[PDB]
Amino acid sequence: MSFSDQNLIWIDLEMTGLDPEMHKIIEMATIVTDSELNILAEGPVIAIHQPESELAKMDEWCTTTHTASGLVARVRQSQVSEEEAIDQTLAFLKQWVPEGKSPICGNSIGQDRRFLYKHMPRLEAYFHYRYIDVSTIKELTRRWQPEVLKEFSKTGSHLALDDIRESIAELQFYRKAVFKI
Numbered sequence: 728m729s730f731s732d733q734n735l736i737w738i739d740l741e742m743t744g745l746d747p748e749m750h751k752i753i754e755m756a757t758i759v760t761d762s763e764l765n766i767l768a769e770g771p772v773i774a775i776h777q778p779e780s781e782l783a784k785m786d787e788w789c790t791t792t793h794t795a796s797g798l799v800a801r802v803r804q805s806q807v808s809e810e811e812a813i814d815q816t817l818a819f820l821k822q823w824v825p826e827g828k829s830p831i832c833g834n835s836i837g838q839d840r841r842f843l844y845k846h847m848p849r850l851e852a853y854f855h856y857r858y859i860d861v862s863t864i865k866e867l868t869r870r871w872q873p874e875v876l877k878e879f880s881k882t883g884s885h886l887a888l889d890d891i892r893e894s895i896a897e898l899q900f901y902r903k904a905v906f907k908i
């Protein structure tokens with residue numbers, strides 16, 4: 728409906744660990760905003776099935792985090808593979824943003840892009856090569872006027888959709904708090 732090459736694709740992944748060569752994607756979510764950060768549509772929220780041997784690579788931090796959130800139980804119950812998750816996500820995105828136009832948007836989104844390169848290259852290809860990393864702005868604010876950061880709080884639940892929603896809210900806060908455009 729509001730299909731435009733100015734729209735922004737927001738994405739978050741949850742993984743069994745930090746190393747793309749070793750670990751696996753267990754959840755994915757996407758959100759599309761317009762260029763002014765108004766949320767236009769939320770994409771598929773997909774817990775991706777992984778066998779126990781892949782879940783068994785998780786360290787204590789990932790095990791407790793993803794178990795307490797209910798994600799591990801959703802992963803075990805899920806019947807959706809990476810390729811099906813890719814198919815679902817691309818069928819969503821093609822309705823809102825053309826291929827190759829939106830930078831990848833999120834918090835420390837470079838780490839997610841590594842997992843996309845390795846495990847979902849067809850989806851990585853959908854993004855423009857640039858990055859919109861909200862944590863870049865967080866870091867500069869911490870150094871230039873850290874007191875600003877006390878006016879914003881994150882829950883940080885590691886549920887992919889809630890975490891992207893918090894990323895958009897964080898950038899919305901910065902536009903009023905540290906930007907003048």
Ligand code: NA
Binds near residue numbers: 739834
């Ligand atoms: Na993340």
